[PDB]
Coordinates of C-alpha atoms and ligand atoms in Angstrom, one line a residue:
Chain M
X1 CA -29.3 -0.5 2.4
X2 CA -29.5 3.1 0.9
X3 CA -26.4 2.7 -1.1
X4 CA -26.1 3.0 -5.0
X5 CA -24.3 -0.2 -5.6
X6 CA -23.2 1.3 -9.0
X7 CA -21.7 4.2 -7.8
X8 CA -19.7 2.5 -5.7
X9 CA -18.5 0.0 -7.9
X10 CA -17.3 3.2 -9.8
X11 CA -15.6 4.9 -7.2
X12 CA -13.4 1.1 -6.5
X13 CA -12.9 1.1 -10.4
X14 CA -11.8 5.1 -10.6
X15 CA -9.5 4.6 -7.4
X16 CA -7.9 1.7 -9.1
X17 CA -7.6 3.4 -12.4
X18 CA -5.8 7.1 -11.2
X19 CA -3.5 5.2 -8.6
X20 CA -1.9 3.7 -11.7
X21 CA -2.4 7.0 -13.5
X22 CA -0.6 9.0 -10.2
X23 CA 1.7 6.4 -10.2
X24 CA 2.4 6.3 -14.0
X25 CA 2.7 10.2 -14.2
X26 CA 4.9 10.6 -10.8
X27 CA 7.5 8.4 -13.2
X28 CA 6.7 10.4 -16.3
X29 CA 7.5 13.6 -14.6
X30 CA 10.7 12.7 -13.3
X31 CA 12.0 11.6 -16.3
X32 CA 11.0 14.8 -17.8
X33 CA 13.7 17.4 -19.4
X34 CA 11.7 19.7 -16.8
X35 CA 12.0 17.2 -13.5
X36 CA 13.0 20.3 -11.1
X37 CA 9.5 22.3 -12.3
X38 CA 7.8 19.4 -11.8
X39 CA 8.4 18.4 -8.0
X40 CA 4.9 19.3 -6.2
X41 CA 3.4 17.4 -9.6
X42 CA 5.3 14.3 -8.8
X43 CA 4.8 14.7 -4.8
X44 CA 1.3 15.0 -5.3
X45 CA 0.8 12.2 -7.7
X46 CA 2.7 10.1 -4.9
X47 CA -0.1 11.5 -2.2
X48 CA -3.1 10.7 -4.9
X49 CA -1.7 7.4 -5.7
X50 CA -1.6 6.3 -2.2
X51 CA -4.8 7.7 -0.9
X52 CA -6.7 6.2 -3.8
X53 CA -4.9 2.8 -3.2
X54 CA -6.0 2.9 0.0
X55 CA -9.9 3.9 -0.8
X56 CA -10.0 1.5 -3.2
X57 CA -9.6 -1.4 -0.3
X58 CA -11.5 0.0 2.0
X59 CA -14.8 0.4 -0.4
X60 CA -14.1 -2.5 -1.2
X61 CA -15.0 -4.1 2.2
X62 CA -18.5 -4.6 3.3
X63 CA -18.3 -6.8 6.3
X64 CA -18.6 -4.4 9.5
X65 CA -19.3 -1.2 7.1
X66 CA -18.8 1.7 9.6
X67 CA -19.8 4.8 7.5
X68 CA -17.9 7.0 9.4
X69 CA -15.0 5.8 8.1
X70 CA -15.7 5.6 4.7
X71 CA -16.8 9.0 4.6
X72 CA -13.5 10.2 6.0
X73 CA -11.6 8.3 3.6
X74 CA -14.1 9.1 0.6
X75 CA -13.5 13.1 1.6
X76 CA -9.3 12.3 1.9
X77 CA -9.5 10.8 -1.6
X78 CA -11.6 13.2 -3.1
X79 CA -9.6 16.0 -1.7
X80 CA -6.5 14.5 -2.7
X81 CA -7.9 14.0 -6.2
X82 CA -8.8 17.8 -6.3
X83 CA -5.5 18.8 -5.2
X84 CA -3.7 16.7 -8.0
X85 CA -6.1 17.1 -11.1
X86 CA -5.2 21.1 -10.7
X87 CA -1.6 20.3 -10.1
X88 CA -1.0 17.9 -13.4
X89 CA -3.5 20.4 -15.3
X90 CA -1.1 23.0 -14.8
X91 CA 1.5 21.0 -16.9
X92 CA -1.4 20.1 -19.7
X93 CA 0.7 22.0 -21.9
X94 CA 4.3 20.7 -21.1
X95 CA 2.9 17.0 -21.9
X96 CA 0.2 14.6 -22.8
X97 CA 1.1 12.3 -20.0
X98 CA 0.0 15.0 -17.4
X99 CA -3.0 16.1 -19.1
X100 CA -4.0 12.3 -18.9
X101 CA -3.4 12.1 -15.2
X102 CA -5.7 15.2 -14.7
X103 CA -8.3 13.8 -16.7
X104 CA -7.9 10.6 -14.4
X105 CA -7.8 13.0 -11.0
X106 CA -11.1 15.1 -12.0
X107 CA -12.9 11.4 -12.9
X108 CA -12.2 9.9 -9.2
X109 CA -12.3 13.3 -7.2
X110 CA -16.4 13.3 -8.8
X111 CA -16.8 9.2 -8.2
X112 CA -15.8 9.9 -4.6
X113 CA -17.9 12.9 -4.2
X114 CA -20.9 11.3 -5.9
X115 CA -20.8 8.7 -3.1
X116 CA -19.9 10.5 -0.2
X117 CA -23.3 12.9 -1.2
X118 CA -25.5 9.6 -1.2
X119 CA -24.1 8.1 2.2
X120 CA -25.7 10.9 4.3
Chain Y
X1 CA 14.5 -1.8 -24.8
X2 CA 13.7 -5.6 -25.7
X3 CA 10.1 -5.3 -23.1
X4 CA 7.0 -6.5 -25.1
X5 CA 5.2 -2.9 -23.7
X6 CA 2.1 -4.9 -24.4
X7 CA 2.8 -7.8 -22.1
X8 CA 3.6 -4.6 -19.3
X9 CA 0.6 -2.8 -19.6
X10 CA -1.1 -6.6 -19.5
X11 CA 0.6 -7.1 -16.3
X12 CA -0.1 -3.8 -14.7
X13 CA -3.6 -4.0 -15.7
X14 CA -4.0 -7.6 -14.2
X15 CA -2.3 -6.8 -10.6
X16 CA -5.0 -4.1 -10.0
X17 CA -7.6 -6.0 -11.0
X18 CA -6.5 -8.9 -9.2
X19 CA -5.6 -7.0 -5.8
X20 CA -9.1 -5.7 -5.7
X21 CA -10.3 -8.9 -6.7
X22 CA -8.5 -10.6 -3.6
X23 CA -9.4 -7.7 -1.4
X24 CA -13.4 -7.9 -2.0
X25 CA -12.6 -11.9 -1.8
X26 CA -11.1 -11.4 1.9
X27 CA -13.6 -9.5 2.9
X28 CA -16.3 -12.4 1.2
X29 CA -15.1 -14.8 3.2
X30 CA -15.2 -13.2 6.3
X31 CA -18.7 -12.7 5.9
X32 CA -19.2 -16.5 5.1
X33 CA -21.3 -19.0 7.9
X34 CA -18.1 -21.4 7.3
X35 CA -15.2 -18.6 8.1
X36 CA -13.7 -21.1 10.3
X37 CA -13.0 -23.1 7.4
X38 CA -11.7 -20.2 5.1
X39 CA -8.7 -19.0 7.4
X40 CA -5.7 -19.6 5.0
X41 CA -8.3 -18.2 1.8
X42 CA -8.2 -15.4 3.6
X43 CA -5.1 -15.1 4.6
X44 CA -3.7 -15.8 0.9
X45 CA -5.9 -13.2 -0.6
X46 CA -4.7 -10.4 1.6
X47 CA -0.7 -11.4 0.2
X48 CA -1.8 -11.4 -2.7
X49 CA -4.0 -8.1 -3.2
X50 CA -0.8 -6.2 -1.0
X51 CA 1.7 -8.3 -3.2
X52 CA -0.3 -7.0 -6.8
X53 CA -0.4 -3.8 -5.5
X54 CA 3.3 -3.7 -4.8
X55 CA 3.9 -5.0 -8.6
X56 CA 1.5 -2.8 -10.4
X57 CA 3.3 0.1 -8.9
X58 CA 7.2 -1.5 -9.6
X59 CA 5.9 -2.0 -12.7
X60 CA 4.1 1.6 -13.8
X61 CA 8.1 3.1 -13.1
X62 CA 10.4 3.3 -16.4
X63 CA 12.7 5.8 -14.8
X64 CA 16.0 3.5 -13.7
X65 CA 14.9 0.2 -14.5
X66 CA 16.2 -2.1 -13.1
X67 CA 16.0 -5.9 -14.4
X68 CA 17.0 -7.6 -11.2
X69 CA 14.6 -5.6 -9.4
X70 CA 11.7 -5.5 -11.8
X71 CA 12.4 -9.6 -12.3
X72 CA 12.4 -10.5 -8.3
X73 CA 9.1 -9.0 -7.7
X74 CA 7.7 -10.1 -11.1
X75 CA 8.6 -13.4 -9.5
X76 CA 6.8 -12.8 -6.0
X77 CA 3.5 -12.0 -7.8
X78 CA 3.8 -14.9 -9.8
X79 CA 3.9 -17.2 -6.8
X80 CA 1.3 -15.5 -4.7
X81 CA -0.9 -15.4 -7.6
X82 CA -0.8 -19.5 -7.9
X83 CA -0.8 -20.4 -4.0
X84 CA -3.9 -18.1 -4.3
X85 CA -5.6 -19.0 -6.6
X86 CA -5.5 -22.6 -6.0
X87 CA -6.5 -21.5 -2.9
X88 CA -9.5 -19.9 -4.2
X89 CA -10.7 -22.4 -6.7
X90 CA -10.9 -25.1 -3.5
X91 CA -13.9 -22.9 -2.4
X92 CA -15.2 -22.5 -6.1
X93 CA -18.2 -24.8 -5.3
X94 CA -19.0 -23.2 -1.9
X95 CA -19.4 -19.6 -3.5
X96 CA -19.2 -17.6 -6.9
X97 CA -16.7 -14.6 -5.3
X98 CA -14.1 -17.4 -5.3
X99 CA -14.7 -18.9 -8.2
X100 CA -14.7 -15.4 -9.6
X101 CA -11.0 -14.8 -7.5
X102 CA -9.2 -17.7 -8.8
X103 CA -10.2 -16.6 -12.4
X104 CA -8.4 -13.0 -11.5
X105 CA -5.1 -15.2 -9.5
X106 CA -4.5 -17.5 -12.5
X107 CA -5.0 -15.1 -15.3
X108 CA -2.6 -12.6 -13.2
X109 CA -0.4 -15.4 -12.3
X110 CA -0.1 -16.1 -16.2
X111 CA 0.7 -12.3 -17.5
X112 CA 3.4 -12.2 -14.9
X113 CA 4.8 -15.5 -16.1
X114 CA 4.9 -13.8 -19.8
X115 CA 6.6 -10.7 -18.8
X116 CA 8.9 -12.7 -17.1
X117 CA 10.0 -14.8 -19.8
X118 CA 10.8 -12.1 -22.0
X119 CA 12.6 -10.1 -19.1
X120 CA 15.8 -13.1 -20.3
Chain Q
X1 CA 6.7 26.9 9.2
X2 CA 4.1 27.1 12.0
X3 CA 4.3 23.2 11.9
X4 CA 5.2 20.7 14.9
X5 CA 8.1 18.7 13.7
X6 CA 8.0 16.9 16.7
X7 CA 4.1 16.3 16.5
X8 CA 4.9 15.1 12.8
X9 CA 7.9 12.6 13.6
X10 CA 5.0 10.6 16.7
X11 CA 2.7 10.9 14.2
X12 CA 4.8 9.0 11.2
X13 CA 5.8 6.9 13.7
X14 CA 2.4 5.9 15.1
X15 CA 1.1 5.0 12.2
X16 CA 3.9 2.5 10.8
X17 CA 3.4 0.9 14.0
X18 CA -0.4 1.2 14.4
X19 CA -1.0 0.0 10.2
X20 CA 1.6 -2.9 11.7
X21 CA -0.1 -3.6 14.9
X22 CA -3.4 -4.0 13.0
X23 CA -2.5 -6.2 10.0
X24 CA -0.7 -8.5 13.1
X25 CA -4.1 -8.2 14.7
X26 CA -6.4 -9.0 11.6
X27 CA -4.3 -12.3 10.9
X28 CA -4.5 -13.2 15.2
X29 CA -8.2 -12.7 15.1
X30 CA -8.0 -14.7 12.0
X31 CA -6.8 -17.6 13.9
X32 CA -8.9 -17.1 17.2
X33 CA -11.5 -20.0 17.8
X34 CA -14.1 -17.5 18.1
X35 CA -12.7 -16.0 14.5
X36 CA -17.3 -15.9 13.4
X37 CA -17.8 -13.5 16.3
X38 CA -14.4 -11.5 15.4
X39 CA -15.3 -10.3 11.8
X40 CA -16.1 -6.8 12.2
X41 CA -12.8 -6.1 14.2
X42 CA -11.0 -8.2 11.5
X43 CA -12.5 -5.8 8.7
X44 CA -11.8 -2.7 11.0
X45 CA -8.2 -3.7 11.0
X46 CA -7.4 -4.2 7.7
X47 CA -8.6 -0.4 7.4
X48 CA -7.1 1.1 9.7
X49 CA -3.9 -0.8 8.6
X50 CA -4.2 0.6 5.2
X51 CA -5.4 4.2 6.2
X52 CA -2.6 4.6 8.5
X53 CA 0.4 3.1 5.5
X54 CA -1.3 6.2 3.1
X55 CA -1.0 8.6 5.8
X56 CA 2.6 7.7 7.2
X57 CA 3.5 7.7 3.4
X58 CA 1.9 11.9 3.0
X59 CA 3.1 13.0 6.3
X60 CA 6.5 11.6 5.5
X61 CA 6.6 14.0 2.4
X62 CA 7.3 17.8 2.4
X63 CA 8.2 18.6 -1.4
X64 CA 5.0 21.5 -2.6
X65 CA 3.0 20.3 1.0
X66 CA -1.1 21.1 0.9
X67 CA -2.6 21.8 4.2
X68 CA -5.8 21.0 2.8
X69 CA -4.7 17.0 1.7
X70 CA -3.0 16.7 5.0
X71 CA -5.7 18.1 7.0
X72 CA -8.2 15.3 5.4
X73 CA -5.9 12.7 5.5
X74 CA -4.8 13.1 9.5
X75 CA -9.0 13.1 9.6
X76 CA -9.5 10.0 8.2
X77 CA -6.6 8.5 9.9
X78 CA -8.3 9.7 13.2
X79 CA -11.6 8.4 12.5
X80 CA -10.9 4.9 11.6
X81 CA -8.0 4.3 14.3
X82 CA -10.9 5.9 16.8
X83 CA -12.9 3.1 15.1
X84 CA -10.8 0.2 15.2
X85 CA -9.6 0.9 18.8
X86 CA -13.6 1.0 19.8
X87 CA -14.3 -2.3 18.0
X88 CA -10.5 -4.1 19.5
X89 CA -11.2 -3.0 23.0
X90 CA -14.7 -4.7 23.0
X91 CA -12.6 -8.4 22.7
X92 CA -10.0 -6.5 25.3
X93 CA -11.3 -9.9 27.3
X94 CA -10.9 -12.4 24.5
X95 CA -6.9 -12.3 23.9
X96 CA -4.0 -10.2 25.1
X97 CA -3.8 -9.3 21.0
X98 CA -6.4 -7.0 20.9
X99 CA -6.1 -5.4 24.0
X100 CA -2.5 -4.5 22.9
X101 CA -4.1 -3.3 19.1
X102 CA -6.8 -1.1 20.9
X103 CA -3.7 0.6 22.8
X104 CA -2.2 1.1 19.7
X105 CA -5.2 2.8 18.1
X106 CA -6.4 4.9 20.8
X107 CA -2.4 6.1 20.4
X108 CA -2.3 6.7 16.2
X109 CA -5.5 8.4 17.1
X110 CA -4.5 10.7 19.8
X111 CA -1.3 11.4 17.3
X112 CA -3.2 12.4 14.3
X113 CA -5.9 14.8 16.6
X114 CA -2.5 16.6 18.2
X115 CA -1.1 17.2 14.4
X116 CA -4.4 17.9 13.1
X117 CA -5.4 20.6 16.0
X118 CA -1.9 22.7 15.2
X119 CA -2.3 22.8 11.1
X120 CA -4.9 25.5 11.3
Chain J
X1 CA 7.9 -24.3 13.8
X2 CA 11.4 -24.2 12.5
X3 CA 11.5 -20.2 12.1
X4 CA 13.4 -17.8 14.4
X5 CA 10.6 -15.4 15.6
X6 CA 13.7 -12.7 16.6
X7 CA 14.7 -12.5 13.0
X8 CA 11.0 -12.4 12.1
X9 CA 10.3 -9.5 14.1
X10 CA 13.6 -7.8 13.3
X11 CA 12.7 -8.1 9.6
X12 CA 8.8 -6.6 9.9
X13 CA 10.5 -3.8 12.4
X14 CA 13.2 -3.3 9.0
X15 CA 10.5 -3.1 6.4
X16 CA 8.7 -0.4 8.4
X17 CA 11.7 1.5 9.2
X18 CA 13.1 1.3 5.8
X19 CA 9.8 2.0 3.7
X20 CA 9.3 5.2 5.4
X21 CA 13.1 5.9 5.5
X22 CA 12.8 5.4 1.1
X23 CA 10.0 7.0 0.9
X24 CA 11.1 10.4 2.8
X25 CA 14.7 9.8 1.0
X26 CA 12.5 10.1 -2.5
X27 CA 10.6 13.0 -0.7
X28 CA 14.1 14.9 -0.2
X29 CA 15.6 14.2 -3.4
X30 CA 12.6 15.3 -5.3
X31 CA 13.5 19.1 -3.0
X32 CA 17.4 18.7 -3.7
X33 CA 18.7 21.4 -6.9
X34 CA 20.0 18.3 -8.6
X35 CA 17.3 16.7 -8.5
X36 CA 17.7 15.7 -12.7
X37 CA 20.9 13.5 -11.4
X38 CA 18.7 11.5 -8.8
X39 CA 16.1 10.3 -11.0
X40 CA 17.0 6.8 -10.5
X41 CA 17.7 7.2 -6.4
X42 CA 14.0 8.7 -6.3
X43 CA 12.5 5.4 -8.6
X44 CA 14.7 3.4 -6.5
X45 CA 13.2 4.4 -3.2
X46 CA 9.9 4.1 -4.5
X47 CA 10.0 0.5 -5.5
X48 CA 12.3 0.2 -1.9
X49 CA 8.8 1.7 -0.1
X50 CA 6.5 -0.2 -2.1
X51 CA 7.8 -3.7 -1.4
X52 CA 9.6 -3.2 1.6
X53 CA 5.6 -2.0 2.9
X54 CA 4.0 -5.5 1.4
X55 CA 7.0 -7.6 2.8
X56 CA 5.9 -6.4 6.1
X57 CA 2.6 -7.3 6.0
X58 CA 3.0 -10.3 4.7
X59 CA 5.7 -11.6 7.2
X60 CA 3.2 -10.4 9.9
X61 CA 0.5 -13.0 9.0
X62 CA 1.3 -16.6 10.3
X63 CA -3.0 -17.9 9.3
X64 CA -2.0 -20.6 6.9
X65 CA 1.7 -19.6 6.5
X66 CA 3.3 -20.8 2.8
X67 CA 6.9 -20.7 2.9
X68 CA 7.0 -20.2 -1.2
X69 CA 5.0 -17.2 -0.5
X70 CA 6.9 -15.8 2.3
X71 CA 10.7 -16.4 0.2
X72 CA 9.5 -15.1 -2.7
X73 CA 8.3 -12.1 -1.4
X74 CA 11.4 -11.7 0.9
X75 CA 14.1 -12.2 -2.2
X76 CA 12.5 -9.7 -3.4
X77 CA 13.0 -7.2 -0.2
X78 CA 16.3 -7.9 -0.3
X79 CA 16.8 -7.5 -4.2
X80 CA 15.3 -4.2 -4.1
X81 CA 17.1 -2.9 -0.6
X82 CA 20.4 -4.0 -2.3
X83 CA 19.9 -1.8 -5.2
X84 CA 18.4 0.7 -3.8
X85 CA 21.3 0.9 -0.5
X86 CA 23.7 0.9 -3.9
X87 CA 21.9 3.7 -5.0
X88 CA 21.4 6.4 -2.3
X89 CA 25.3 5.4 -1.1
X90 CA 26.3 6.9 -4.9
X91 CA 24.9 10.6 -2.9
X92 CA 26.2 10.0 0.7
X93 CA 28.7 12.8 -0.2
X94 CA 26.3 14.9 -1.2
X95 CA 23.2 14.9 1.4
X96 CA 23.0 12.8 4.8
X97 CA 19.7 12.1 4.1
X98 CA 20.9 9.5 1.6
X99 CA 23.7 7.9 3.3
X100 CA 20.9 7.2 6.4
X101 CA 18.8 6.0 4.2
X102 CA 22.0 3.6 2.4
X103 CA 22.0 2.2 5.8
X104 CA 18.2 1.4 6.2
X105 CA 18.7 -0.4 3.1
X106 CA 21.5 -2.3 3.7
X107 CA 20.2 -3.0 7.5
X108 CA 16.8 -4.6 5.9
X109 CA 18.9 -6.5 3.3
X110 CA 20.5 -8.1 6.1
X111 CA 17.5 -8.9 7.9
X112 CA 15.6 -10.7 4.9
X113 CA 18.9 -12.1 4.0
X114 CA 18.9 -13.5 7.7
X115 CA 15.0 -14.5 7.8
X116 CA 15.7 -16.2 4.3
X117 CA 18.4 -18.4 4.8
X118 CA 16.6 -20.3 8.1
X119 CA 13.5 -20.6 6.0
X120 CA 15.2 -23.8 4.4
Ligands
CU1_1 CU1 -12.9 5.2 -5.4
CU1_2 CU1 -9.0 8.1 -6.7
CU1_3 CU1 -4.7 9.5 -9.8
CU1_4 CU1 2.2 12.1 -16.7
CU1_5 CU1 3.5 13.4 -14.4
CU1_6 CU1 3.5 15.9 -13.6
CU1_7 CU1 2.2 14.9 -11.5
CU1_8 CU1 -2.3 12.5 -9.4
CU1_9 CU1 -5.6 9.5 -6.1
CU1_10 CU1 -10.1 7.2 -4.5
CU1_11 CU1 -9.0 10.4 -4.8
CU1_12 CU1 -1.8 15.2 -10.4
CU1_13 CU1 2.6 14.4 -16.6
CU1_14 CU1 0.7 14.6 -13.9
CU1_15 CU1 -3.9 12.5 -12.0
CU1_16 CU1 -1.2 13.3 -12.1
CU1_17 CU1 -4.9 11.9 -8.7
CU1_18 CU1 -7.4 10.4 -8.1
CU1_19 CU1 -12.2 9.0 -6.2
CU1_20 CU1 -14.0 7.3 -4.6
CU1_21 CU1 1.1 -7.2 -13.1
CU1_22 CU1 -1.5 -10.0 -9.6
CU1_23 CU1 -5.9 -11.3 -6.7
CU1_24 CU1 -13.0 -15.1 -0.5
CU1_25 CU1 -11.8 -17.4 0.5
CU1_26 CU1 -9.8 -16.2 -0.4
CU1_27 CU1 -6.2 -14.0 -3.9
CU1_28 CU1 -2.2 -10.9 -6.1
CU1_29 CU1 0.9 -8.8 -9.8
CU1_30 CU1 0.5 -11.9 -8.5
CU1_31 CU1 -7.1 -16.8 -3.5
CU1_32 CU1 -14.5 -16.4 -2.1
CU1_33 CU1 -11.4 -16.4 -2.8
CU1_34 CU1 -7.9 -14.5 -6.5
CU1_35 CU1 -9.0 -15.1 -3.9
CU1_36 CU1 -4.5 -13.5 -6.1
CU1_37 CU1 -3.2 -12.2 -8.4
CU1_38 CU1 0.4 -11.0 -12.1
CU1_39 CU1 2.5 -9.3 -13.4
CU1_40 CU1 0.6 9.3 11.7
CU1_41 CU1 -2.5 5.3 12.6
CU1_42 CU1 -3.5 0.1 14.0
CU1_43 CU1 -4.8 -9.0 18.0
CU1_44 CU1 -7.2 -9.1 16.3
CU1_45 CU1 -9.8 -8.6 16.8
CU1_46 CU1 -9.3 -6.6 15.1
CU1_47 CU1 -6.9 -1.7 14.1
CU1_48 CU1 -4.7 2.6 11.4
CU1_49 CU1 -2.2 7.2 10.8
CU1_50 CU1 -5.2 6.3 12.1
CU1_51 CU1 -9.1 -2.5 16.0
CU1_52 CU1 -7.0 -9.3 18.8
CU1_53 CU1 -7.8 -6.3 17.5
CU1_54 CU1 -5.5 -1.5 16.9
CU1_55 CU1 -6.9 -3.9 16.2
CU1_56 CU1 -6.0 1.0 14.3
CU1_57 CU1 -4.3 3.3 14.1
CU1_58 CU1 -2.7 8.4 13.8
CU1_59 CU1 -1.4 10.7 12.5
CU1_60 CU1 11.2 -7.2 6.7
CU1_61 CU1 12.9 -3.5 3.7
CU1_62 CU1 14.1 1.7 2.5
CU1_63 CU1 16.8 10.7 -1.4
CU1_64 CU1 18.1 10.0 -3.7
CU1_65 CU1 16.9 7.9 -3.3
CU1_66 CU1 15.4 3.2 -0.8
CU1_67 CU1 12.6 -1.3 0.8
CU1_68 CU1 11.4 -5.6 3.5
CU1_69 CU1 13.7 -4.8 1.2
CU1_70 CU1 18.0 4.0 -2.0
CU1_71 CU1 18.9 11.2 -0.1
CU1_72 CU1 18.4 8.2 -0.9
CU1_73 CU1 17.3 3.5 1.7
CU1_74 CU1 17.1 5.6 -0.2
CU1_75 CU1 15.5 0.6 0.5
CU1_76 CU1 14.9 -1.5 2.4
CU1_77 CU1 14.4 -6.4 4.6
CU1_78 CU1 12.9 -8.7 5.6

């Protein structure tokens, strides 16, 4: 009743769009000359991936909304986020592919925080 | 080396779109007076948004590909996607969300089909 | 280093069979009579079944480990199993199913508050 | 009505066992110093995790059951274990982390093999 219907259809399209990008960039990473520099990027995108994955489902689900739980889950995925956009920044330089992904990381980590300020 | 990578990023694109599509058409239903009547719907949909999620992911990973692999759950989506959709479109006169969800099953079922035909 | 391995091995372990437990328990309530009084606990579940894959799936990873994702995952996690075991026990009367699903839940979530407590 | 609910269960227990099992085996690779020469083991495992997680849930819902659904989505379990039990066995020598998880594979192989063959 108090929620901004657009901001969460953005935070569901941004989770969507940097699991792929986690996903996506995990691969890129380990096929990388580099791979054995690269392992906490490629863990991480495998944590960012499956957090947003799961955010994206459960903001997705209205019936029963319980905003204790999507809090929780909005802070996991924005902290998750966070933790990955500085990590794939950090290789902006060694490839494009990364600087993507961190680009992708910052854009959800400020979708889920610009909900999870609006659901009080 | 033969992959239309157009026809890949098609495919990937469609499985999240169509996961989320089935997850928010789950949860539709559920909130429905005629539930009851909706069982297998929902059922279907919650294959098929855990079966696109599966193949968005298989598919985002270059590293190692594997044909076999890649072709078998290519395969899978393709036959959730259709049981679902014409799952959905039964209930396209009852409400938009499934018209709206067999729209997102059949045009994922297709871009599956089409990277699966070129896969030889 | 100041980690229980012990406390991390129940926890992994709770959750594949809690996210397991509750996707069983989403499709039984599914196919309860009284499935139009049952929605809430059906939503809850596919939550906490999705909530508890991501977190088995970044507990079950040590490669460059963050305190700070784990901590706000194992919080989430928490939260919606305490959730979902709430909203199962209140049809504890209804079917055997949910009874068995609240046990579960209550157990993920005792799990995740013992690994939580000890990361500091 | 036909189905043998042992081999059912056996197969969800498998898929759990064995996406967690691929998905820490991807986690230790990713930590081992020749980590370049296990690219494919690490993809491998993550597909293994990925569709070995939807198999599960998929085989635990029996609401409006669709045995093209359910085979499709376990010959491709039991594609993906076969490679990736191929693929971990290739480092058995070199790290008991992979030939455990070689035999997770090959045990849920088996068990969608199993489930498969009495699905007519
Ligand atoms: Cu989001
Ligand atoms: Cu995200
Ligand atoms: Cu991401
Ligand atoms: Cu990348
Ligand atoms: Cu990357
Ligand atoms: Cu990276
Ligand atoms: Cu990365
Ligand atoms: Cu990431
Ligand atoms: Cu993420
Ligand atoms: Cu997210
Ligand atoms: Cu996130
Ligand atoms: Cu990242
Ligand atoms: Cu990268
Ligand atoms: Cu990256
Ligand atoms: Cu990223
Ligand atoms: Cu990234
Ligand atoms: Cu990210
Ligand atoms: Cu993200
Ligand atoms: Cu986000
Ligand atoms: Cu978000
Ligand atoms: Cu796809
Ligand atoms: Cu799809
Ligand atoms: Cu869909
Ligand atoms: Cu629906
Ligand atoms: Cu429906
Ligand atoms: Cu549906
Ligand atoms: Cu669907
Ligand atoms: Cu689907
Ligand atoms: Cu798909
Ligand atoms: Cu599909
Ligand atoms: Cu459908
Ligand atoms: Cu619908
Ligand atoms: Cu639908
Ligand atoms: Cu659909
Ligand atoms: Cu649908
Ligand atoms: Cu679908
Ligand atoms: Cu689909
Ligand atoms: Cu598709
Ligand atoms: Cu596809
Ligand atoms: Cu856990
Ligand atoms: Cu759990
Ligand atoms: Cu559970
Ligand atoms: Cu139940
Ligand atoms: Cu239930
Ligand atoms: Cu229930
Ligand atoms: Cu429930
Ligand atoms: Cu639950
Ligand atoms: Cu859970
Ligand atoms: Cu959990
Ligand atoms: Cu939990
Ligand atoms: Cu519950
Ligand atoms: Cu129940
Ligand atoms: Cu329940
Ligand atoms: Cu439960
Ligand atoms: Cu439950
Ligand atoms: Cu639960
Ligand atoms: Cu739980
Ligand atoms: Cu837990
Ligand atoms: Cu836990
Ligand atoms: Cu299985
Ligand atoms: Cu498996
Ligand atoms: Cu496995
Ligand atoms: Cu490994
Ligand atoms: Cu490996
Ligand atoms: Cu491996
Ligand atoms: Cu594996
Ligand atoms: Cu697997
Ligand atoms: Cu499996
Ligand atoms: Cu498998
Ligand atoms: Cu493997
Ligand atoms: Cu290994
Ligand atoms: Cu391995
Ligand atoms: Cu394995
Ligand atoms: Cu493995
Ligand atoms: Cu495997
Ligand atoms: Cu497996
Ligand atoms: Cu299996
Ligand atoms: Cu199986």
């Amino acid at each position: 009743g108090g929620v901004d219907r657009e901001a969460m259809a953005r935070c569901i399209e941004e989770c969507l769009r940097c699991a792929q990008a986690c996903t996506a960039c995990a691969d890129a990473c380990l096929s990388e000359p580099t791979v054995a520099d690269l392992t906490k990027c490629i863990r991480t995108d495998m944590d960012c991936a499956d957090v947003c994955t799961a955010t994206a489902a459960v903001l997705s689900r209205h019936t029963g909304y319980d905003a204790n739980v999507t809090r929780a889950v909005l802070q996991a995925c924005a902290t998750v986020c966070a933790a990955c956009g500085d990590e794939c920044a950090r290789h902006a330089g060694m490839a494009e592919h990364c600087r993507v992904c961190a680009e992708a990381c910052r854009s959800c980590e400020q979708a889920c925080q610009e909900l999870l300020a609006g659901l009080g």
